[PDB]
């Protein structure tokens, strides 16, 4: 198998050979170190003093390229920086993700979720949950967060992705980029004139001109690219995982805390991101017994780390009622997922509304093959036929 070891999955789990890899070992056509132990991953990611994030990195680089990011060194990209610089940028974008801001988004996320569910219900059982829900809700949620008018969301999605879609002609990508920046600049101007509750309005309300247009543009794109695939992947695999353990669906038929715990567990169990941004040792050091030399690259396997046998004797099982396990699916350290609360809220809303609307949800065909999404930076499904 030519595909990198950290990219291999078996069903909803990490490949056996990935799970069998040592805590920290070398892998290969550049070569890097690979961290699979929970403690090691936490050490590498939490110590920004010795492991800086590899500036200008693409979560794809393989067979595909169809619909993937294009950095070009984008200012305002939290990932391309480290403290104290990172701390400055982060603090600047934080106003849009406060928990109070997230609580207020709850009602809107529900509205969006129900609107997609309405379209699926109208199509009749059986239907593809991925086409109707998983692939639609994330982007709409992000548009709502950013402050994009409801009627411009479809257009905005096309312009955002399009101006970064390599598979497109240069004439097209450039036309889409022109319109994109133009639209973005006009949105930014309106937010500075009269700040709204959106991400941009929150930032400009707090820091005014200190937040330049370039920064805001950078923030928007970065956020648009960071919160889509991860979520669509979680919705699809998440529903599949729950349908395979139907008794655990009761965690979504009760209080909020119970739904929250289920979501956290699903996020740990499925760990859609294969790995975070590569970490580069800023000096020579000895980790997990290995001799790391300045300039060495370290790839962290979040899925393997979240299956570390040290975490629990049944860490390999899905158990929404288990004693919560501090997973690393959102990362660890100063770069910890800025949209983690939103992701948890969004995913809790989807699952709760889903099973409330379709109590008898099930796979259209018990023996149907699973259509895994293998061409994206995050694991997921391309299709999932369900009946109710
Ligand atoms: C279940 C879904 C999600 C997962 C599993 C996830 C996971 C991650 C991981 C592992 C990192 C850290 C990367 C690193 O340290 O190199 C990260 C960073 C980040 N995520 Fe997410 N993410 C999710 C959803 C979202 C959403 C919905 C948004 C946006 C609303 C988002 C915004 C970000 C941003 C901006 C960062 C960078 C923070 C920084 O560098 O300081 N993510 N995410």
UniProtKB/Swiss-Prot annotation:
Q: Which PROSITE patterns match?
A: CYTOCHROME_P450
GO biological process assignments: vancomycin biosynthetic process
Which cofactor is recorded for it? heme
Give the top-rank taxon of the lineage listed in the UniProt record for this protein.
Bacteria
One Pfam family this sequence matches: p450
Q: What is a GO molecular function of this protein?
A: oxidoreductase activity, acting on paired donors, with incorporation or reduction of molecular oxygen
Cite the annotated pathway.
Answer: Antibiotic biosynthesis; vancomycin biosynthesis
What EC numbers are recorded for this enzyme?
1.14.-.-
Q: Write out the entry's keywords from A to Z.
A: Heme, Iron, Metal-binding, Monooxygenase, Oxidoreductase
Q: Which PANTHER family match?
A: P450, PUTATIVE (EUROFUNG)-RELATED
Q: What does this protein do?
A: Involved in the coupling of aromatic side chains of the heptapeptide of vancomycin.
Entry's family note: Belongs to the cytochrome P450 family.
Descriptive protein name: Cytochrome P450 165B3
- Which organism encodes this protein? Amycolatopsis orientalis (Nocardia orientalis)
From the broadest rank down, the organism's phylogenetic lineage runs: Bacteria, Bacillati, Actinomycetota, Actinomycetes, Pseudonocardiales
Q: Which gene encodes it?
A: cyp165B3
């Amino acid at each position: 198998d030519p595909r990198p070891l950290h990219i291999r999955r078996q069903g909803l789990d990490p490949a056996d050979e990935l799970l069998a890899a040592g805590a920290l070992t070398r892998v290969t056509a550049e070569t890097h170190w690979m961290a699979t132990a929970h403690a090691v991953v936490r050490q590498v990611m939490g110590d920004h003093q010795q492991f800086s994030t590899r500036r200008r990195w693409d979560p794809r680089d393989e067979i595909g390229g169809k619909g993937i990011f294009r950095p070009r060194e984008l200012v305002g990209n939290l990932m391309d920086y480290d403290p104290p610089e990172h701390t400055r940028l982060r603090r600047k974008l934080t106003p849009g993700f406060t928990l109070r801001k997230m609580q207020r988004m709850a009602p809107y996320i529900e509205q969006i979720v129900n609107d997609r569910l309405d379209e699926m219900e109208r199509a009749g059982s059986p239907a593809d949950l991925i086409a109707f829900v998983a692939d639609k809700v994330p982007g709409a949620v992000l548009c709502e967060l950013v402050g994009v008018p409801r009627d411009d969301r479809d257009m905005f999605m096309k312009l955002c992705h399009g101006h970064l879609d390599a598979s497109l002609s240069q004439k097209r990508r450039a036309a889409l980029g022109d319109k994109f920046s133009r639209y973005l600049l006009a949105m930014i101007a309106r937010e500075r004139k009269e700040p709204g509750e959106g991400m941009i309005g929150a930032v400009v309300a707090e820091y005014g001109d200190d937040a330049t247009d370039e920064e805001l543009r950078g923030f928007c794109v970065q956020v648009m690219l960071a919160g889509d695939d991860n979520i669509s992947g979680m919705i699809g695999l998440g529903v599949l995982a729950m349908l395979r353990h139907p008794e655990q669906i009761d965690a979504f038929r009760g209080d909020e805390q119970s739904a929250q715990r289920a979501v956290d567990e699903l996020i740990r169990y499925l760990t859609v991101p294969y790995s975070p941004t590569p970490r580069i040792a800023r000096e020579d050091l000895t980790l997990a017994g290995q001799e790391i030399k300045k300039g060495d690259s370290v790839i962290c396997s979040l899925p393997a780390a979240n299956r570390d046998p040290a975490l629990a004797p049944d860490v390999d099982r899905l158990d929404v009622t288990r004693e919560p396990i501090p997973h690393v699916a959102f990362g660890h350290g100063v770069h910890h997922c800025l949209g983690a609360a939103l992701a948890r809220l969004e995913l809790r809303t989807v699952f709760t509304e889903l099973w409330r609307r379709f109590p008898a949800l099930r796979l259209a065909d018990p023996a149907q093959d699973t259509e895994f999404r293998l061409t994206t930076p995050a694991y997921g499904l391309t299709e999932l036929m369900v009946a109710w």
